[PDB]
Write a protein that binds this DNA or RNA. Structure first.
Ligand code: K
Ligand code: K
Ligand code: K
Ligand code: K
Ligand code: K
Ligand code: K
Ligand code: K
Ligand code: K
Ligand code: K
Ligand code: K
Ligand code: K
Ligand code: K
Ligand code: K
Ligand code: K
Ligand code: MG
Ligand code: MG
Length: 1323
DNA sequence: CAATACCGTGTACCAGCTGAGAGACTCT
DNA sequence: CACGGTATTG
């Protein structure tokens, strides 16, 4: 009675099967609980659990942060009102009340219905004088008269509620008054250097050309046009691009060897400009200085479109400009339409359903939708030239609250705010005392490194307080410890040392950590010369010498440098051979050289006394990102260096963390030697033990202290903390649960083996392509504009990624010829089963790669390596892709053997984690030598094994027929894996978790590893094999080709498979989010307790968490007589907590009385019901049902559908043609299933007519569409499908009355344990 | 209760920690 | 996207 378990782990399924030593699936009687006739049932021990995908926490996180945003914005308004409270009471005692109740209707209003002034005359007068809030903003900024306190509040509140972004550091002081003079000064500074070839700025309207509502690039072309004998890629062209906020590269301008890309907005611009000036000289400094100057004057030309010399509120003035032009253009457009085409006027100005001005202002039409609607109308009319000009600049009839206002920095709003405060503090003293308070309310932002301002009731918070008092925008620095919080922000997330768990790992760029990495690589290098008999380790003295002379003088150390600069220069070796490193050393002393460039003091860095200091500095540069805190923490070392060095140190920041702690690296000492790990790396006699040898050596103390430092998660917690998609972690947890239930099913006997197999955006594509094209300087999107959806075509995506060129040949590709080109695998897919862009390429003909058995040929490499490097720099291909392309100049036979091995050997980390979990759960006992006793072998397989087995022995799978293929996959996994390790017991080292003992031959072996199943094999030449296959040594039978294939065939043909759909309470959003207009419908849900939706509108479409069976009574008629009822009441997500708090009260409040409490059945989604003739239904909600049966199509028809549909060989085609009649029979099957179970008369008859319509079609296509027909019978929700060209729309089960009298089936996870409840016996 | 058709919150920026893949060193 | 909510037509 021994058995094995097969598992197929996916993101929506866990297939499971139990097999004996004869590869048979057992069957058992299982008890059946409940109140029905049936006391037990026969079950095959095979099946599959289905479940809805697990979801990421991301959407939840976005919702949470937006909630915190709304809370804090409301609090901003509340702070402001609190400052205004006393004096507004003197001016208008119900102003803020009218504001808070502005949403209410006039019935529900407690005050007068005009919010600002409280009477109609003054309200109309206000709106006449101030059509938009920006009119009032500009008036309050510019005017000197005392103003109404309510208008002052409204202006400041508008600025504080919509305050703009915080993406620009420092203060901004708009001034565009002398852009022309700054541009002329730039031209003068340039012409100073180049007296031989100056630029004549006379007549160049830089103010207009550069501030035009055009792209930065567009304006570059125009301006260069104004400068004769000057070209856009010359030096002045690049300086103009610089002033415009572009990223020009001055490499060609100065004949540099390295790139000199420069961007003014980048926070690294100062050091980059110093880099460049070190290359070219400080005589050019002024040049870039001048650039900066001009750049400060035109920085915001796009949002500030008004002369800043007339008003101190140029943003509101630009909004007023939008408004005035909207008015003028609307007047003109109305007149033009009235004149030239009156019949359209209504449509344009009255029909909200159309995308006219009506839909633009009152309907749901957007500015883009509106422009698209009205542009043909404009082009048809005459007199619309300037209107079309504004239309094609996205600047016609603009609103003032638009999508593009995200550009506006908070400094602009703050400027207008401070201006209003300065104006009106002359008249209201409280505005003078609270000016900085209001400014702070606008400017204050919770720092990212502080997080929620919690008090011990937030699982997301880490902030610590200096004092226990309420935090406000004004006492934040005093109440909150910014430093401790910034530290905890990073430290709550960083690893501890796996060897010393109570120690934090070092920063990745710590000097100590890089010394460690270097010496660790160095201590395993070996060398020989002529006179040497055998390879020798480097001594301690030799390694110190190499670090000093090579690693501390070059950022990277190449093997050639090691050979010449050391062995020749120091040891006088004319020739030497090196091992332990190839080409160059992986490790390096990057931080050493950075700090050298900064402090310019080699002796300081090399002095060991300073070790700690440097560590701390790097820690501070890694831990903190706020330059002020960096300064605060580094101040204690400001005495050791001068001002300029501290200035450079601040701008020097690092990210990233290592794997080891300082205590492990250079702290713990071996008791006898008294040496740290780094000491042994520096010098260890002639043993040269490295880190792994050092921590595992029993003749040293290190291993003991590691064990002393070592130190209880649950299964759920352990699985949650794995790295992987939540969708697959769900499947992993369900897998472990399934294995537990199966073990219990076998009387708590553990299996011999467990075989596990695990199965294997348009905006990102658009972003990649935009970035690559703008990095390329290409106009390919100008000439061939593309939308993100279109990029889902593989060949077009590859076209855009390749700059429209063949990759194996330096020739342009043609878009319209994409169908004629080839997509080739760089490494051939017979070796590396990689089908991603990283291994694929668009070429005219794949023949041009060279030979199809290897990497693209050397000739192609020689041709194209420069273009490939250009694509790599633009990040249009990856380094992996470039390396695979260029490998011919560097596939050995070892590579191909390894590629096959990896085709068959699972090495994914996540599958290894599933294997670890199962292996640790099964094998818990240790033997007399304290070794683990591996009772259960956990085998892991890739899908190709069972896939090839299916395709070889005609056990074909068609996913669309039903869900059985998951269970069948589990069974085949078990069979193949157990047979495999039975045949070749050595292969355990590769397939069993935890098992380990450490080219043409291994290639042959691993390619033909599965031949032992076959009777005859064609390698190549024909090989014949015996009928009974046995173990090499034991002689145990492993495969009988005369019986075991029949066994697999009978198992795959079993009609009773335990497909279980995991019942799940629904969670998440309460309902659809659309805030719908008011309506008469009880289906409307109030958005606030007192906002009756009949007056105010609200949400509809709530999601049901789970339904509830109620047996009770309802009042009927005017008399209110009671009437016994049994019905399904869906409990929505919003009602759930209330219903669970006290269910009888909830139900009585719903209109049910005398509810039978013990007969209340909670029915989660997908709950299973059986009716008549075995027809099964699943709960989709309280009012809808899903198909609940599986169509067990006979195996012969499955294989027919596979081969006939081309899902080659002559025997297969003759079988397809000989068994053509099968088509009819298949339909018959479907029909007889539907009439019994699906119950969709109209859809079924439409399908039958469609099949009888296309009988004369090729058998291949009729099969390809019979595949689509199974959507009619598929388990789950009804869905639309298409037969050839006809469309069958889903038939929905829109009533749940029938299941109230049917049989409810409570299933365990495997579905073996059932509890059946006859619901007709209730009521 | 049909059959049927419609509908469904979206975008943008900034600061991090983590593992994993891939294909080559060194090792337990 | 998909599939459950809703209103409409009957
Ligand atoms: K019973
Ligand atoms: K966010
Ligand atoms: K009223
Ligand atoms: K020119
Ligand atoms: K609109
Ligand atoms: K015309
Ligand atoms: K609006
Ligand atoms: K290397
Ligand atoms: K940092
Ligand atoms: K292994
Ligand atoms: K729950
Ligand atoms: K959930
Ligand atoms: K969900
Ligand atoms: K269940
Ligand atoms: Mg709220
Ligand atoms: Mg709004």
């Amino acid at each position: 009675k021994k058995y094995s378990i097969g598992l197929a782990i996916g993101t929506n399924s866990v297939g499971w099967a139990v097999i004996t030593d004869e590869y048979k699936v057992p069957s058992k009687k299982f008890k059946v609980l409940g109140n029905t006739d049936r006391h037990s049932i026969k079950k095959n021990l095979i099946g599959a659990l289905l479940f809805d995908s697990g979801e990421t926490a991301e959407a939840t996180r976005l919702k949470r942060t937006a909630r915190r945003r709304y809370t804090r914005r409301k609090n901003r308004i509340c702070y402001l009102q609190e400052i205004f409270s006393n004096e507004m009471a003197k001016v208008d005692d119900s102003f803020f009340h009218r504001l808070e109740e502005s949403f209410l209707v006039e019935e529900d209003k407690k005050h007068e219905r005009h919010p600002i002034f409280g009477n109609i005359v003054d309200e109309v007068a206000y709106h006449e004088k101030y059509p938009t809030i920006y009119h009032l903003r500009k008036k309050l900024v510019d005017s000197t008269d005392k103003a109404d306190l309510r208008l002052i509040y409204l202006a400041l509140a508008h600025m504080i509620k919509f305050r703009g972004h915080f993406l620009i550091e420092g203060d901004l002081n708009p001034d565009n008054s002398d852009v022309d003079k700054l541009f002329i000064q730039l031209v003068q500074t340039y012409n100073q250097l180049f007296e031989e070839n100056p630029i004549n700025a006379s007549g160049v309207d830089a103010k207009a050309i550069l501030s035009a509502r055009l792209s930065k690039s567009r304006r570059l072309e125009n301006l260069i046009a104004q400068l004769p004998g000057e070209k856009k890629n010359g030096l002045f062209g690049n300086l103009i691009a610089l002033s415009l906020g572009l990223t020009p590269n001055f490499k060609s301008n100065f004949d540099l060897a390295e790139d000199a890309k420069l961007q003014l907005s980048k926070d690294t611009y100062d050091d980059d400009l110093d880099n460049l000036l070190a290359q070219i000289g400080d005589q050019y400094a002024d040049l870039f200085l001048a650039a900066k100057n001009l750049s400060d004057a035109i920085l915001l030309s796009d949002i500030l479109r008004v002369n800043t010399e007339i008003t101190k509120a140029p943003l509101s003035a630009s909004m007023i400009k939008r408004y005035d032009e909207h008015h003028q253009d609307l007047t003109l457009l109305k007149a033009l339409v009235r004149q030239q085409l009156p019949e359209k006027y209504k449509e344009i100005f009255f029909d909200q359903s159309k995308n006219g001005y009506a839909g633009y202002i009152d309907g749901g039409a957007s500015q883009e939708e509106f422009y698209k609607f009205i542009k043909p109308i404009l082009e048809k009319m005459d007199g619309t030239e300037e209107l079309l000009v504004k239309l094609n600049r996205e600047d016609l009839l603009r609103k003032q609250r638009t999508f593009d206002n995200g550009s506006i920095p908070h400094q602009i709003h703050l400027g207008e705010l401070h201006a209003i405060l300065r104006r009106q503090e002359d008249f209201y003293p409280f505005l003078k005392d609270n000016r900085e308070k209001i400014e702070k309310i606008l400017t204050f932002r919770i720092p990212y490194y502080v997080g929620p301002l919690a008090r011990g009731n937030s699982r997301f918070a880490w902030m610590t307080r200096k004092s226990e008092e309420t935090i406000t925008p004004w006492n934040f620095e005093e109440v909150v410890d910014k430093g401790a919080s910034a530290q905890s922000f990073i430290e709550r997330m960083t690893n501890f040392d796996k060897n010393l768990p109570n120690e934090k790992v070092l920063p990745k760029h710590s000097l100590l950590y890089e010394y460690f990495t270097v010496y660790n690589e160095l201590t395993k290098v070996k060398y020989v010369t002529e006179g040497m008999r055998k390879p020798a380790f480097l001594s301690g003295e030799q390694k110190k010498a190499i670090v000093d002379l090579l690693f501390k003088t070059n950022r990277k150390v190449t093997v050639k440098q090691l050979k010449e600069d050391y062995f020749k220069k120091i040891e006088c070796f004319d020739s030497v051979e090196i091992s332990g490193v190839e080409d160059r050393f992986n490790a390096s002393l990057g931080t050493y050289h950075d700090l050298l460039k900064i402090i310019k003091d080699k002796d300081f860095l090399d002095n060991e006394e300073n070790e700690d200091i440097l560590e701390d500095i790097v820690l501070t540069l890694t831990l903190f990102e706020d330059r002020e805190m960096i300064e605060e923490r580094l101040k204690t070392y400001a005495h050791l260096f001068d001002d300029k060095v501290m200035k450079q140190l601040k701008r020097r920041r690092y990210t990233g963390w290592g794997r080891l702690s300082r205590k492990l690296i250079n702290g713990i000492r071996d008791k006898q030697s008294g040496k740290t790990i780094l000491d042994f790396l520096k010098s260890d006699g002639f043993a040269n033990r490295n880190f792994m040898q050092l921590i595992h050596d029993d003749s040293l103390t290190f291993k003991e202290d590691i064990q002393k430092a070592q130190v209880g998660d649950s299964l759920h917690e352990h699985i949650a903390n794995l790295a992987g998609s939540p969708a697959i972690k769900k499947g992993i947890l369900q897998t472990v649960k399934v294995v537990d239930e199966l073990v219990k099913v076998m009387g708590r006997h553990k299996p011999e083996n467990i075989v596990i197999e695990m199965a294997r955006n348009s905006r990102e594509r658009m972003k990649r392509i935009e970035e690559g094209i703008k990095e390329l300087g290409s106009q390919i999107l100008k000439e061939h504009p593309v939308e993100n959806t279109q990029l889902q075509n593989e060949k077009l995506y590859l076209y855009y990624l390749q700059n429209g060129r063949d990759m194996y040949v330096d020739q342009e590709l043609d878009i319209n010829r994409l169908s004629d080109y080839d997509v080739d695998a760089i490494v051939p897919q017979s070796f590396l089963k990689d089908d991603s862009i990283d291994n694929k390429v668009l070429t005219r003909s794949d023949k041009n790669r060279g030979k199809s058995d290897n990497v693209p040929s050397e000739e192609v490499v020689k041709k194209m390596k420069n273009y490939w490097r250009q694509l790599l720099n633009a990040k249009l291909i990856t380094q992996r892709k470039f390396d695979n392309l260029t490998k011919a100049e560097r596939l050995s036979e070892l590579d191909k053997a390894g590629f096959i091995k990896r085709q068959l050997v699972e090495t994914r980390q996540i599958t290894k984690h599933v294997a670890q979990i199962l292996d640790s759960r099964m094998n818990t006992k240790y033997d007399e030598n304290d070794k683990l006793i591996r009772e259960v072998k956990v085998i892991t397989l890739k899908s190709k094994l069972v896939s090839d087995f299916r395709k070889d022995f005609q056990f074909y799978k068609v996913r669309e027929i039903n869900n059985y293929h998951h269970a069948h996959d589990a069974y085949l996994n078990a069979v193949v894996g157990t047979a495999l390790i039975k045949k070749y017991p050595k292969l355990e080292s590769e397939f069993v978790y935890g098992d380990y003992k450490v080219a043409t031959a291994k290639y042959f072996f691993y390619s033909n590893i599965m031949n032992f199943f076959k009777t005859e094999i064609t390698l190549g030449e024909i090989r014949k094999r015996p009928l009974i296959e046995t173990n090499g040594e034991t002689g145990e039978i492993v495969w009988d080709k005369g019986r075991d294939f029949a066994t697999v065939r009978k198992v795959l043909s079993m009609p009773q498979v335990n497909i279980v759909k995991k019942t799940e309470v629904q969670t998440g959003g309460f309902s659809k989010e659309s805030i719908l207009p008011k309506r008469n419908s009880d289906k409307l849900i109030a958005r606030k307790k007192d906002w009756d939706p009949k007056k105010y509108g609200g949400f509809d479409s709530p999601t049901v968490a789970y339904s509830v069976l109620v047996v009770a009574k309802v009042e009927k008629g005017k008399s209110k007589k009671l009437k016994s009822v049994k019905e399904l009441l869906g409990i929505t997500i919003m009602e759930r907590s209330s219903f669970e708090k006290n269910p009888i009260d909830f139900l009585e409040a719903k209109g049910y009385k005398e509810v039978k409490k013990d007969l209340i059945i909670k029915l989660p989604k997908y709950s299973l019901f059986e009716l008549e003739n075995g027809r099964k239904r699943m709960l989709a909600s309280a009012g809808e049902l899903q198909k609940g049966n599986e169509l067990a199509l006979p195996s012969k028809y499955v294989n027919f559908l596979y081969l006939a549909s081309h899902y080659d060989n002559e025997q297969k085609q003759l079988f397809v043609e000989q068994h053509k009649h099968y088509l009819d029979e298949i339909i018959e099957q479907i029909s007889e299933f539907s009439k019994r179970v699906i119950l969709a008369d109209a859809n079924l008859d439409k399908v039958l007519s469609a099949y009888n319509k296309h009988r004369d079609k090729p058998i291949r296509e009729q099969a390809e569409n019979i595949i689509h027909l199974f959507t009619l019978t598929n388990l789950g929700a009804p869905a639309a499908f298409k037969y050839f060209d006809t469309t069958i729309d889903r038939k929905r089960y829109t009533s749940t009355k029938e299941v109230l009298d049917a049989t409810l089936i409570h299933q365990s996870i495997t579905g073996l344990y059932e509890t059946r409840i006859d619901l007709s016996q209730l009521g």
